[PDB]
Write a protein that binds this ligand. Sequence first.
Ligand SMILES: [Ca+2]
Ligand SMILES: [Co+2]
Length: 119
Amino acid sequence: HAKECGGVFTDPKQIFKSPGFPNEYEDNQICYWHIRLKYGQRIHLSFLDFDLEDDPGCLADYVEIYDSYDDVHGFVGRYCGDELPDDIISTGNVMTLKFLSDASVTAGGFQIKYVAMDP
Ligand SMILES: [Ca+2]
Ligand SMILES: [Co+2]
């Protein structure tokens, strides 16, 4: 139980896993993680593991990161393949992660850490 993932996260620190990790993710997976810390705090995001389906535009499988509390504002990047994306630091107290896999081809998945940064 199961292909369940995401929600809102307000703790100082957490490691997000792709559903099933360390098993490969499944097809047709969508997950949203919304990080919200205290006003004045920022988010240091780091990639422990990253292995998704690869294609030139990441049109199939991807993890998207937003420097905001939605998946509309402050788009920082879209990632796939087996390269570890560089660390991401938020400009504010909010960050949004979206994972999507399409109908075919799976890979190892990911573990992504965030930690609070104080002023
Ligand atoms: Ca796929
Ligand atoms: Co606007």
